[PDB]
Design a protein around this ligand. Structure first.
Ligand SMILES: [Mg+2]
Ligand SMILES: [Mg+2]
Ligand SMILES: [Mg+2]
Ligand SMILES: [Mg+2]
Ligand SMILES: [Mg+2]
Ligand SMILES: [Mg+2]
Ligand SMILES: [Mg+2]
Ligand SMILES: [Mg+2]
Ligand SMILES: [Mg+2]
Ligand SMILES: [Mg+2]
Ligand SMILES: [Mg+2]
Ligand SMILES: [Mg+2]
Ligand SMILES: [Mg+2]
Ligand SMILES: [Mg+2]
Ligand SMILES: [Mg+2]
Ligand SMILES: [Mg+2]
Ligand SMILES: [Mg+2]
Ligand SMILES: [Mg+2]
Ligand SMILES: [Mg+2]
Ligand SMILES: [Mg+2]
Ligand SMILES: [Mg+2]
Ligand SMILES: [Mg+2]
Ligand SMILES: [Mg+2]
Ligand SMILES: [Mg+2]
Ligand SMILES: [Mg+2]
Ligand SMILES: [Mg+2]
Ligand SMILES: [Mg+2]
Ligand SMILES: [Mg+2]
Ligand SMILES: [Mg+2]
Ligand SMILES: [Mg+2]
Ligand SMILES: [Mg+2]
Ligand SMILES: [Mg+2]
Ligand SMILES: [Mg+2]
Ligand SMILES: [Mg+2]
Ligand SMILES: [Mg+2]
Ligand SMILES: [Mg+2]
Ligand SMILES: [Mg+2]
Ligand SMILES: [Mg+2]
Ligand SMILES: [Mg+2]
Ligand SMILES: [Mg+2]
Ligand SMILES: [Mg+2]
Ligand SMILES: [Mg+2]
Ligand SMILES: [Mg+2]
Ligand SMILES: [Mg+2]
Ligand SMILES: [Mg+2]
Ligand SMILES: [Mg+2]
Ligand SMILES: [Mg+2]
Ligand SMILES: [Mg+2]
Ligand SMILES: [Mg+2]
Ligand SMILES: [Mg+2]
Ligand SMILES: [Mg+2]
Ligand SMILES: [Mg+2]
Ligand SMILES: [Mg+2]
Ligand SMILES: [Mg+2]
Lengths: 46, 271, 93
RNA sequence: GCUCGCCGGAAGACCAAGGGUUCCUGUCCAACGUUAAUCGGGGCAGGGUGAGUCGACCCCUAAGGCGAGGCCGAAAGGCGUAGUCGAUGGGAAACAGGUUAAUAUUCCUGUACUUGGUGUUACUGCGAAGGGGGGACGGAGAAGGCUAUGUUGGCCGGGCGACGGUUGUCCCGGUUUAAGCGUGUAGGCUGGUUUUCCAGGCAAAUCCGGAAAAUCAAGGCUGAGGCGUGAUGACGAGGCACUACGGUGCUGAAGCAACAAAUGCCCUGCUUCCAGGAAAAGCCUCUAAGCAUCAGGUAACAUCAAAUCGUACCCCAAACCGACACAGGUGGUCAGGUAGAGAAUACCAAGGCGCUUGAGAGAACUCGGGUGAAGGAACUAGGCAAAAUGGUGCCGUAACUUCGGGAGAAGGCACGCUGAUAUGUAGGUGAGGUCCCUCGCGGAUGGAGCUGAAAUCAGUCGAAGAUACCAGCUGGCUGCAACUGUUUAUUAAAAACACAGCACUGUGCAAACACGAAAGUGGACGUAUACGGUGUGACGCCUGCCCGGUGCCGGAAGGUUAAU
RNA sequence: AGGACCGAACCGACUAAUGUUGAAAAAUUAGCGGAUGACUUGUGGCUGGGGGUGAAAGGCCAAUCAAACCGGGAGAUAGCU
């Protein structure tokens, strides 16, 4: 059966990657929150 | 030519084709072609803003000359072509200076016929004049609403306007709707009707034929749930409401014209 | 020209293996670990200058470092660049 | 290691995506592995990915994204112009052989190709952000010509058989060779050529478009394959010498032809249809400003450059998505033999596997199957399930019908093998030879050889010849929906939704309508033979009466009636 | 020619049995429907929550849907247990 996660690195990096985050203010808030919590990995990017 | 298909399959039993042998069987003129990709009836917000639009055959856009503004220079009809983008056929015409243009093909025009545009032009089908230079009573098509803007009225297969009156700066036109309308007598019109008057006698014959033309299914409101549509709901086939649109506006009689800007130009509404 | 300072950085170590040994005896090719940003042009220049030999062609690959566990902690060794340096004639390096 | 079994349009092979060292080697067996484990996709260590030509990057654009200014919006922001990004598409070029424990179109050998920069020499109007051409495009069908590939023969090497026979019309194996270069063939397209003129291609043009003349007819473009060369090479059955017995080292025969033949190629063709079938660059050409015995262009030759990143390995799966070494899911490519219409099916090849608990026993009962006396739906809500039918050719086939259908209606007959017709026929292919020859990859003739249906007659075996696998049950009456479709992912597939058709109604274009505080955008680069909304739902015959109620449309005298 | 017919790939899901602490949070087996089209599929893109999308089942919108998920208001309120 086809499950929901169908990986594509391009789609991953465009949907949830660093530069997508940076492109909107709500995306930059996501990063701010994640830096404040002290997340080792800010984005899917890495 | 109006031709019934033989019932060799259930999807062919009711097909009625309109087949013109004069239509160029080859490919269109490339310098007058442009790309025109499809919308799905969806706007710049990506929302469906016109329902029931999607799929259908890829189509190139033919640059038709509705202005018909190359005055004084005669042109010969080279060939009549199918245009996918409209109901009328188009004519590839050759101006005597080596320029080709598409025009809307009038009723009775054929390869070899000469057309001209302008004030001096003769009164024959395919000739575009300012409507001040056209006899009252004349059938015309591709009629301008504003001088120089290009024809906007009577462009569909078989359509035409009559010049019922001229009073100074304005001609009164009977439109296909039966609306009597005023227009500035400087506005251009082409003489004769639009061709392909058999367009309306075509019978698509099957669901897929509409799908080919890029028309997706219409679901009746009464087949929906109340959350979807005012007509929604019922245990069985129920209705008991005044017919409305999906946004609740009465859809059997209620007038929706509200344009006070252009009301001065309408002599009498269609009725 | 590439500067001598650059050239003195680019070559890191001789790579020692059976494949590197065979390369040298069969096809007169020295296998070098090089700086990860070293270009084929820089490697050729450095081998010629530093090892005083004549190079035919450099071939390069980036070796991905292995992920390794060390006392239940998970690390990763560094990527490095290896250069197969084909010598001309009998240069002997 | 030897047998046995299984897959073989896969359970083989090669990839993309995704994963990321799982790859190879050595070592270890705690944990992991549904058992044991000496083994492992486990632990630990070391090794392993080599490119001008493959791919990415790159140049070019699609949908779409972002977007200087701009327009719009309490703010945040939205939209969008110029631009700039964005492949799933367009754009230069490498093949064969060999080699590693593990990479190879990347290394090596041999033999190539492409683009760019210089320099040199000769020739010479170069020059774009512009013009034109090209790139550049659908579905279906048909028929040639081909090749991959196969088969048989010939050739060469080897064999003469564990049990009757097997020196033969006998058995086994091999019989392979590329890109490139040269040649221009089946086929496809188009008349060339020269001169002059011109309201067109924003300017210009020698280009494109148009017009008028003359002249000549083959001229050009495109194109599979074959053929030659590449290749006096490489490869090669096998033999010989070692072996650290796993593997190496050394030498090397034949290497032809006929026939069959793709879904691949000619073919982005041709024919045909309507639903009418990207863009941009590379590329080719044209000129403008400009430059001028200079730059620059073209050609030849020499030389130099072609970076950077990916490259292991799995990839219908134990390595990806499914918590699992999970009967699931996952796009592309390749396509051997016999039988067969076939990529169905059966048995096999190459190749790969026996599915990580076994050993016994041979109760009930459950599961999956086989067979069944007599009966034959009596079972049951219901023939649920099972049983059955099942091929090809031919004969034959009802009501009814929208004249297509119904129809594979129904029902029936023939079917293997052998011989003869005919030591293999009809048909297909076609050598040599002969003749002509705008002389060749030519034509005609010719038929060797090869391949080869189908049928008739005669005979013959079995209970049974479509013998397996494979493979319609059929008919009668009737409800509903015209039909093909669509639907409740995971208890409903239907009579529900859709549907062509019909009708009503709105809508004159800055359309109605829809998304949107707006700007905009969709409707539509459409224009009433159009578009939106609503109901009905092929077709046939039709569709009655009621405007009191509610709603809509029209009217506007009068009554009432807001802010002011 | 065909939303033509029979039938693999491919797409689907009518019937039955199995399974129901499954091999599997929807499958397997045997049958079944479509199979040039209103077909199917790869890659990428767009539509966002009273919002989308829907040949319309209140279907679907990441095993979640008569109003997704996440965080917050938040220790909502709970004459109830
Ligand atoms: Mg509609
Ligand atoms: Mg409709
Ligand atoms: Mg309903
Ligand atoms: Mg409501
Ligand atoms: Mg009722
Ligand atoms: Mg009632
Ligand atoms: Mg090299
Ligand atoms: Mg590399
Ligand atoms: Mg590991
Ligand atoms: Mg291993
Ligand atoms: Mg164990
Ligand atoms: Mg033990
Ligand atoms: Mg291991
Ligand atoms: Mg924008
Ligand atoms: Mg701005
Ligand atoms: Mg853009
Ligand atoms: Mg770009
Ligand atoms: Mg691409
Ligand atoms: Mg390997
Ligand atoms: Mg052949
Ligand atoms: Mg096919
Ligand atoms: Mg590999
Ligand atoms: Mg297992
Ligand atoms: Mg599995
Ligand atoms: Mg599949
Ligand atoms: Mg099979
Ligand atoms: Mg088998
Ligand atoms: Mg038993
Ligand atoms: Mg049993
Ligand atoms: Mg039985
Ligand atoms: Mg019995
Ligand atoms: Mg019996
Ligand atoms: Mg009986
Ligand atoms: Mg009974
Ligand atoms: Mg009973
Ligand atoms: Mg049954
Ligand atoms: Mg049965
Ligand atoms: Mg009844
Ligand atoms: Mg039905
Ligand atoms: Mg269901
Ligand atoms: Mg069901
Ligand atoms: Mg408009
Ligand atoms: Mg109905
Ligand atoms: Mg009535
Ligand atoms: Mg069909
Ligand atoms: Mg069918
Ligand atoms: Mg479904
Ligand atoms: Mg099944
Ligand atoms: Mg079928
Ligand atoms: Mg309901
Ligand atoms: Mg869900
Ligand atoms: Mg709510
Ligand atoms: Mg509170
Ligand atoms: Mg609480």
């Amino acid at each position: 059966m086809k499950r929901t996660f169908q990986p594509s690195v391009l789609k991953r990096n465009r949907s949830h990657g660093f530069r997508a985050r940076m492109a909107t203010k709500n995306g930059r808030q996501v990063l701010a929150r994640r830096r404040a919590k002290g997340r080792a990995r800010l984005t899917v990017s890495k | 030519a109006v031709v019934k298909c033989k019932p060799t399959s259930p999807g062919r039993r009711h097909v009625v084709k309109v087949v013109n042998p004069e239509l160029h069987k080859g490919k269109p003129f490339a310098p007058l072609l442009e790309k025109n990709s499809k919308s799905g009836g969806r706007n710049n917000n990506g929302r469906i803003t016109t329902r029931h639009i999607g799929g259908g055959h890829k189509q190139a856009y033919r640059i038709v000359d509705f202005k018909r503004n190359k005055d004084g220079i005669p042109a010969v009809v080279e060939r009549l072509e199918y245009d996918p983008n409209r109901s009328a056929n188009i004519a590839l015409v050759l101006y005597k200076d080596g320029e080709r243009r598409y025009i809307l093909a009038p009723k009775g025009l054929k390869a070899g016929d000469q057309i001209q545009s302008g004030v001096d032009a003769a009164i024959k089908p395919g000739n575009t004049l300012p409507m001040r230079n056209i006899p009252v009573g004349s059938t015309v098509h591709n009629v301008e609403m504003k001088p120089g803007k290009g024809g906007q009225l009577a462009r569909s297969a078989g359509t035409y306007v009559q010049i019922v009156a001229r009073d100074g700066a304005y001609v009164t036109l009977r439109l296909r709707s039966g609306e009597m309308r005023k227009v500035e007598a400087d506005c251009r019109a082409t003489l004769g009707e639009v061709g392909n008057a058999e367009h309306m006698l075509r019978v698509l014959g099957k669901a897929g034929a509409a799908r080919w033309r890029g028309v997706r299914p219409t679901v009746r409101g009464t087949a929906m749930n109340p959350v979807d549509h005012p007509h929604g709901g019922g245990e069985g086939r129920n209705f008991g409401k005044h017919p409305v649109t999906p946004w609740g506006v009465q859809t059997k009689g209620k007038k929706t014209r509200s344009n006070k800007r252009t009301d001065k130009f309408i002599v009498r509404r269609r009725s | 020209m590439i500067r001598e300072e650059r050239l003195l950085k680019v070559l890191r170590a001789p790579h020692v293996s059976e494949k590197a040994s065979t390369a040298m005896e069969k096809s007169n090719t020295i296998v070098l670990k090089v700086a990860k940003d070293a270009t084929k042009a820089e490697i050729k220049a450095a081998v010629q200058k530093l090892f005083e030999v004549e190079v035919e062609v450099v071939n390069t690959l980036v070796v991905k470092g292995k992920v390794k566990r060390h006392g239940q902690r998970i690390g990763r060794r560094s990527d490095w660049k290896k250069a197969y340096v084909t010598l001309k004639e009998g240069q002997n390096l």
